[PDB]
Amino acid sequence: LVRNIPCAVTKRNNLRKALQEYAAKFDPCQCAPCPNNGRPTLSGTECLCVCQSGTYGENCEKQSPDYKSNAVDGQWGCWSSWSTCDATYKRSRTRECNNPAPQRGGKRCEGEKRQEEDCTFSIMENNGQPCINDDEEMKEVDLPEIEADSGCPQPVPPENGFIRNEKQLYLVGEDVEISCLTGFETVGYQYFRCLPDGTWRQGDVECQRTECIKPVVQEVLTITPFQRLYRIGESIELTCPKGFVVAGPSRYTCQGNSWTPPISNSLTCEK
Amino acid sequence: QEQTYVISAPKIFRVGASENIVIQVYGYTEAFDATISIKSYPDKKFSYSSGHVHLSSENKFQNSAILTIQPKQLPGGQNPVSYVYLEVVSKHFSKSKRMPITYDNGFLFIHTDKPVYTPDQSVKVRVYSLNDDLKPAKRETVLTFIDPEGSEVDMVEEIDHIGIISFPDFKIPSNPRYGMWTIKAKYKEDFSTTGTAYFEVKEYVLPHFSVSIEPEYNFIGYKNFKNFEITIKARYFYNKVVTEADVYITFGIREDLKDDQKEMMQTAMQNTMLINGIAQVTFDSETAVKELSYYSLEDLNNKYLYIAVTVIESTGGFSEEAEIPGIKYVLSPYKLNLVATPLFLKPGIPYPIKVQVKDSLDQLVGGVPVTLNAQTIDVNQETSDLDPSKSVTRVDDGVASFVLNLPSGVTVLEFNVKTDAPDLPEENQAREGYRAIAYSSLSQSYLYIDWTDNHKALLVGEHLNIIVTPKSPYIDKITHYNYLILSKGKIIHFGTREKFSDASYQSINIPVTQNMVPSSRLLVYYIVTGEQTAELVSDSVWLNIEEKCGNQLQVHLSPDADAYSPGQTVSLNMATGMDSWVALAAVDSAVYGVQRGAKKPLERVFQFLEKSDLGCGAGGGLNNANVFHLAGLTFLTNANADDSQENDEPCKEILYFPESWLWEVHLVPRRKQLQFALPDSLTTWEIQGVGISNTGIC
Amino acid sequence: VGEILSAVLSQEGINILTHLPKGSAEAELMSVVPVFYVFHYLETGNHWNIFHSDPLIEKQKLKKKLKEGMLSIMSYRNADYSYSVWKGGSASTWLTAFALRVLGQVNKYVEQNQNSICNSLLWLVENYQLDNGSFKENSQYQPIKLQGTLPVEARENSLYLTAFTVIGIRKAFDICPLVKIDTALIKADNFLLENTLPAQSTFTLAISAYALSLGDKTHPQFRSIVSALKREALVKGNPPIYRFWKDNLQHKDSSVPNTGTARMVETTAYALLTSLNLKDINYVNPVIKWLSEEQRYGGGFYSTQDTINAIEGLTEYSLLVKQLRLSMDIDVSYKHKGALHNYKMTDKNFLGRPVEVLLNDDLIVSTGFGSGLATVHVTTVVHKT
Amino acid sequence: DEELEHLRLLEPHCFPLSLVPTEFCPSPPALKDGFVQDEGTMFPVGKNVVYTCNEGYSLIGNPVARCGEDLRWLVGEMHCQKIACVLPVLMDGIQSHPQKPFYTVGEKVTVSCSGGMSLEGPSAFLCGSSLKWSPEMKNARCVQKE
Amino acid sequence: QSKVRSVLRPSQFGGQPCTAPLVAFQPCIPSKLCKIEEADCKNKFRCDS
């Protein structure tokens, strides 16, 4: 029920922990068994017996003429302590169900004798619990800031460029450094100066092409991949070395403009 | 609840300041000690300061502790300490309250030898550096020049030995960006005060003559729209009129005081001859605009008349350009505001109201007629009205003063003030209205300061004489009332004022002291504990004090004339009330001519010292806690009050040919004479001395 | 560097030093593997310059336990330099790449016979590389959920395994750069770059992002995958105070550490590691703030993977923060003449006064190893006809 | 016995009070050309005191001392620097006429060079800070010729 | 700050009750500040409660 309050998740997990401990401390398992298979119950620090119908007196000590049954029902003993983590890092604990032992046809204990928990270990330094709520997730879809500081938004880099030091908002006079993707190299002034007006002072920089990346292909291969990057000038063989027949040209080479072949298509050989 | 206490403290502790904390206890008759301490928060573990104070009948159970949070004792590091515990302990009580602390001790004034520099000049700069007590801070200062790009350019730290920090000259970088450079000064270490100044780095020649454009007033309405007289005057900086010149006037319809398409009015571009240095002109908006543009009326132009003026000497090679950036075309020219008006009633005291009238592009309009009408609400909403009083604003102050005789039944007053502008309807003569609320005493146990609207500034060393009347059901029990005098954050004076046998009470007779000179705030309070319940009762008033310098440094040249002559050897005499440092700067008056209205560097420095006043408004308050809070105090009491409910928005109520030389700092041991040759410029040298001593800046 | 958001393991990392029994069923491996990571973390910082309290200062004994660990893991190496969950078990490529990762990470601190690394690498390449589906796993008959994750099974299981193996190889190929291992990295990186972008699962997206971040940090496909990941991110606050990644709603059940929280922590730590490799501190910071609040993922860690990856990420982040600390005496000198200026750049004095460079010389600017990051600008002003 | 201290610490007004301090430091240590600007006897444990220099001096370092629980004054490094300039920097033996060990801020030093020799330097300069002349007397030459 | 103890056995069958208090509390001065937040439940009407 700890569901719609400030810090609801924190207090909920605290109260789970709490209820564990509290059970452990005040479970009626630690009472002496009630007579006439009454149920012990532990209100605070006194055990009270709840009597079966046909048993009466303050602690069920005496029984009506019809309560001939002498069967002793096997109420649970207290859980043993958690065992040391096993070969699968599970701890387990067991309660014999001996308190009293079922006798003369008395019922066996209903709950499972044994419980198992994974050993799970807290390694971070503890500041104390944060206040955490069920509302505390939002995506990209969060609202923009007012940005009244008017510090510049992240600029659009040149094509084949990327922003080295991405930030959501740049203070006035921050350098944002453009850099070029693998095929490309910054020639010029790669830096934009965020002006107090929020204009960028677009730097005199362009990413020339120096390299060509190993091309995408329509096939599992139809290629020999000598390199990840092939210099401007070098060449490549799209090839189907056996059985399959070429359905496209073979030799291709890096011009700095672009790949001469089609990007969308390859030899489409039969493999 | 007979035994009660008030400990009164500045609303915020300044780090490194000495905070005078005053304790009053009521109903005790045995003497006892209390200790007042400042302890680290929340742990109370470190006692930053502690003061032991004896409360006894000759004290009259009133005493104070001088507590100081030394800056290096706070832990510092990544997090500043935002809070501290003020604690009191005695035989009879203990209480502790979380007090805010501020790392903001003292004042940095950046003095730049000129407002304007060409490139290749070095900007000589020095910082005057004052403690929260207005004493030489002796703190090293980090001084940061920001190019109008906003890029950090330079940082220089200089030891403060004197309260004057003569930084090295900052050579303008060999390719500056023109326009408004910024200088930021910060104390290097703990205190995080800031100073800021601006200088414009610009390609300029010193103008030869001060062309002055002096419109009759800064707005155009139905009166003026047909006819708007505007006066040109030009004087040389040696102050002799430009005996003849050709004046060129050009006009534009400027939509905003912004870089714009000015839509220049060739219909109105005009020539006149500067007869003996003056040329009266008038612009007719009708013929100008209708003849050139669609706009038939200022109903279409709630905008600005741009005007630019070229004066050419007509018999000489000099020419100077002057501008007004824009004169507001307006349907409704004026707005009211209150000045020094508490908006709090003192039932049975004449309620002074003061409205200033401001125009658009505000200046004090001086002579506008004003009428005030109000509704008076008595207890149980028993509503009534007052006849609409009229007053003309004071010509040299803009203030229409009013006084309303209020019956002692008034619970709230709400009053409206409107411009009886003869040339307008009310639909354009703007109008305003305000709520004024009574003190809301719970017991009806009121206290009033009978301050007779003495907004005229008080004179240092004169005796104050403020009548105070604790009108209360239990005046039988109110033996005495307490007063506190506040100046900046500090409780500078505190005391007690007996009930005479007649049940008159002593006036506040204390002399106004030199530590009060910017301003002061008087707060007056008593606890009366009638029946079994205490009420803290309090009032405060704003005290306007003369800006009398403590050292009163005065500077004059020994010879005197209409004019000295180029290169004339002259003696500068500096005479002072006390030993003082004095910093001298001569600049050519022309340099301000580079600009329109270039303010002298240390204009209104007392109006900057005033910003350490923690209170706001002219005094009064909604409630005892509100009275203390608006006075800039806070308190510990068991008398059924606390001001933790009193949080509010920030409060904005209003109440050789050198260009510069003589850039020198001297010890003037009460008198000193300089000798120097006046440079060859045929100009008025504005020579500014700034004194620094153990009594602050003059 | 800005805000150094500082987060650390507790001295309760004695829990990791003194870990759960070194038993059968790979419990030994779970015991010793984290010890390498914790040793690395302690190496990467003041922890063996100073402990204020509860010292883990006996780094000699810690190194002994470390090398006894490396022994115990090398025990798991089969005949032909595969690893197996058991001395006689089915050769597992997953386990082998895991071992290789470990050994590469630790070879910076304990020298170990690189020939075994070469042999196990070329085994993993030559026997189990296949096109599009690199490093396809040989049946181990079961996911050992205590050591592996539980991947997504229907699809991108192969993208998961390729990512894992590429990570391992990138951690170990540096100590045996045999050419065909580079060819295999080209193959696997290309397959990841092509297959990953329409990611089904944030977990896989994350891990493969990481793996590619070890590789071509600047490939356009990589940057696309990154730009995706960065949008799968979930946050709190108008400026994010916390940032993390979750998928399949494996978060509703975070009250106790479990496979769901384990997976969430895994995918977050991969995202974090990625970012770090991008050196994106502003991004990283709220992820370190999330990762350091145990409650947000159920308290402790669950399984090995989450734990190791979290320790790794805190290590890296520490490292990064150090590397960014500005301390850089920058020489500027003319080519044919004397020195011109010496900017003693420090975080106290990060600002270089504009220096006039009016002489006609070719102009050199240089610095030592120094520390941190600076940018030097020369403006040339000239009059053109 | 948990009552004996803890509630007396938390609510000291509720028990027989003992407000006058019992442990005192000695006098603050002396300062060269300065003094503790304070009541010279009242030194309870934990009291702060602050030093200041005599006229003509500036207190370098930390002015503040604290009476420790050891009854020793914890005090930082501090020194009274004189306000006056150090000597002009005589790199070329320049004949500074008004020679002094120290020169008041704003005091004008006048300087020349040996006859037949001629200062490449200003003949006069004013002290501005205790370690800084205006102009900056870092350097001036003498050997030049008229 | 709280303090706690445990029943080593409960009273029952009319035995002597656990007359002493089972949990104790003492005033203390915190070393740290609170980080709890207002509900601030967006659009939903915040009762005075």
Interface check B259 vs E, CB under 8 A:
no
Looking at the complex, report in whole angstroms how far the Cα of residue D37 sits from the nearest Cα belonging to chain B: 14
Structure resolution, Å: 3.0
Other C-beta atoms closer than 10 Å to the C-beta of A125 total 15
Give yes or no for a contact between A72 and A106, defined as CB atoms under 8 angstroms apart.
yes
- For residues C314 and C301, the answer to whether their CB atoms sit within 8 Å is no
DSSP codes joined into one string, C351-380: --------SSS-EEEEE-S-BS--------
Most C-contacting residue of A3, A13, A120 (CB-CB within 10 A), to test interface: A120
Question: How does strand B660-677 pair with strand B569-588?
Answer: antiparallel
Which residues have a Cβ under 8 Å from the Cβ of B380 and sit 6 or more positions away? none
CA distance readout (Å), B373 to B218, B417, C22, C170: 29, 6, 92, 85
- Selected residue of A149, A150, A175, A195 to mutate for chain B interface (largest B Cβ count, 10 A): A195
Looking up tokens 């079922």, which residue turns up?
A: A102
CA dist., res. B647 & res. B636, Å (int): 16
**D82 forms bridges with which residues in the sheet?**
D57
Is some CB atom of chain B closer than 8 A to the CB atom of C379?
yes
D11 interaction partners in chain E (CB closer than 8 Å): 27
Tokens of B137: 């801070």
Find, in chain A, the residue whose alpha carbon is nearest to that of C380. A189
Chains A & B: contacts with CB separation below 8 Å: 13
Distances (CA, A) of C297 to A127, B604, C236: 15, 60, 15
Q: Which residues are paired to A67 by β-bridges?
A: none
- Chain D residue with CA closest to B68: the answer is D48
**B672 residue type, one letter:** K
- Determine the residue type at C338: G
Token representation of residue B444: 């009806």
DSSP secondary structure of B544-575: -B----SS--EEEESS--S---TT-EEEEEEE
Query: Alpha-carbon distance C344 to C347, whole Å?
Result: 10
The three-point CA angle B410-B413-B415 to 5° equals 150
Q: Is B79 on the interface with E (CB under 8 A)?
A: no
Task: Quickly tell me which residue has 């050009």 as its tokens.
Answer: B250
For the four alpha carbons of A14, A16, A20 and A23, in that order, the dihedral sign comes to positive
Distances (CA, A) of B128 to B131, B164, B687: 10, 5, 17
Q: CA nearest B462: which of B406, B426, B508? A: B508
Dist CA C108 CA C66 (whole Å): 13
CA C142 to chain centre: 27
Does A163 reach chain C within 8 Å, measured CB to CB?
no
Helix (H, G, I), strand (E, B) or coil at C293: coil
Three-class secondary structure of residue B119 per DSSP: coil
DSSP state of B237: T
DSSP per-residue string spanning B42-76: TT--SEEEEEEEEE-TTTTTEEEEEEE--GGGS--
Token pair in block for residue D133: 């002349």
Tokens of B665: 């700092």
Contact between residue A213 and residue C222 where contact means Cβ atoms under 8 Å apart: no
Which residues sit opposite A153 in a β-bridge?
A169
Count how many Cα atoms sit within 13 Å of the Cα of residue B412 in the half-sphere of its side chain.
8
Specify whether the CB–CB gap between C217 and C198 falls below 8 A.
no
CA–CA distance, C268 with C253 (Å, rounded to integer): 17
Q: Which residues pair with A142 in a beta bridge?
A: none
Distance CA B39, CA B101 (A): 12
- Chain D residues whose beta carbon lies within 8 Å of the beta carbon of residue B168: 132, 136
Query: Which one, of E1, C290, C266, C288, lies nearest residue A132 by Cα?
Result: C290
Cβ atoms C297, C139 nearer than 8 A = no
Secondary structure element (H or E) that encloses residue D35, with its range? strand D34-36
- Chains A–C, number of C-beta pairs less than 8 Å apart: 137
Residue with tokens 């370092």: D61
Q: Write the residue in C349, C353, C381 that is nearest to B175 by C-beta.
A: C381
Mark B399-425 as b/e (b = at least 16 C-beta within 10 Å).
bbbbebebeeebbbbebebbbbbeebe
Name all chains with 3 or more CB-CB pairs below 8 Å to chain D.
B, E
Q: Which residues of E touch A133 (CB under 8 A)?
A: 37
CB B273 within 8 A of CB B279: yes
Torsion sign (Cα): C192, C198, C201, C202: positive
The torsion of the CA quartet B264, B267, B273, B275, rounded to 10 degrees, works out to -90
Residue A24 touches chain E, beta carbons under 8 Å: no
Q: Which string of DSSP letters, residue by residue, matches B250-276?
A: EEEEESSSSS----B-TTT-EEEE-GG
Residue D4 phi, psi dihedral angles, 5° rounding: -65, -40
The pair phi, psi for residue C183, each rounded to 5°, is -55, -40
Chains E/C: 3 or more C-beta pairs closer than 8 A?
Answer: no
Query: How many angstroms separate the CA atoms of C310 and C290, rounded?
Result: 11
E33 contacts B43? CB cut-off 8 A = no
Say how many residues make up chain C: 385
Closest CA to E35 of B538, C293, C81, D4: C293
Residue E15 is classified by DSSP as P
Residues 6 or more apart from D50 whose CB is under 8 A from it? Answer: B70, D36, D37, D38, D63, D64, D65
Question: Would you say how long chain A is, in residues?
Answer: 271
3-class SS at B13?
strand
Q: Which two tokens stand for residue D105?
A: 């801020």
Q: What is the rounded CA–CA span in Å between residue A22 and residue A38?
A: 23
The one-letter amino acid code at B596 reads R
What is the spatial distance between Cα C54 and Cα C34, in angstroms, rounded to a whole number?
20
Q: Is there an interface between E and B (3+ Cβ pairs < 8 A)?
A: yes
Coil, strand or helix at C175: helix
- The identity of residue D37, as a single letter, is Q
Answer left, alpha or beta for residue B60, where phi above 0 means left and psi between -120 and 50 means alpha: left
Q: Please state whether at least 3 CB pairs lie below 8 Å between chains D and A.
A: no
Q: How many CB atoms lie within 10 A of CB B617?
A: 22
Query: Which of C353, C356, C379 to mutate against chain B (most B CBs within 10 Å)?
Result: C353
DSSP C84: B
Beta bridge partners of B111: B126
Where b means 16+ CB within 10 Å and e means fewer, A239-266 reads bbeeebeeebeeebebeeeebebeeeeb
Cβ proximity of B450 and B505 under 8 Å = no
CB D17 within 8 A of CB D8: no
E26 touches chain D (CB under 8 A): yes
Show the 3-state SS of chain A. Answer: CCCCCCCHHHHHHHHHHHHHHHHHHHCHHHCCCCCCCCEEEEECCEEEEECCCCEECCCCCEECCCCCCCCECCCCCCCCCCCCCCCCCEEEEECCCCCCCCECCCCCCCCCCEEEEECCECCECCCCCCCCCCCCCECCCCCCCCCCCCCEECCCCCCCEEECCCCCEECCCCEEEEEECCCEEEEECCEEECCCCCCCCCCCEEEEECEEECCCCCCCCCCCCCCCEEEECEEEECCCCCCCCCCCCCEEEECCCCECCCCCCCCCCCC
- What's the CA angle centered on C310, arms C308 and C316, to 5 degrees? 100
Report residue B220 CA to chain centroid gap.
Answer: 30
- Distance in angstroms (rounded) separating the CA atoms of residues A206 and A203: 9
Angle, helices C93-107/C114-128, rounded to nearest 10 degrees:
150
Put simply, the answer to whether C356 touches B152 (Cβ < 8 Å) is no
Is the distance from CB of A173 to CB of B149 less than 8 angstroms?
yes
Burial of B561 (0-12, 13-18, 19+ CB in 10 A): exposed
- Residue C336 φ/ψ region, left for φ over 0, alpha for ψ in the -120 to 50 degree band, beta for the rest: alpha
By C-alpha distance, the chain D residue nearest E27 is D10
Closest CA–CA distance from residue E44 to any residue of chain D (Å): 42
Tell me how many residue pairs between chain B and chain D have CB atoms under 8 A apart: 66
Contact A173 B148 (CB under 8 A): no
**Does C354 contact B174 at a Cβ distance shorter than 8 Å?**
yes
d(C-alpha C355, C-alpha C343), whole Å: 10
Rounded Cα distance between D62 and D77, Å, is 6
Q: Hey, is the C-beta of A262 within 8 angstroms of any chain C C-beta?
A: no
Which conformational region is residue A37 in: left (phi greater than 0), alpha (psi within -120 to 50 degrees), or beta?
left
Measure the CA–CA gap between A100 and A34, rounded to whole angstroms: 9
Give residue numbers after which chain A breaks (C–N above 2.5 Å): none
Q: Which of residues 3-22 of D touch E (CB under 8 A)?
A: 6-7, 10-11
Rounded to whole angstroms, the Cα distance separating B325 from B150 reads 25
Look-up of token digits 């403020």: B466
- What's the rounded Cα separation, in Å, for the pair B527 and B24? 10
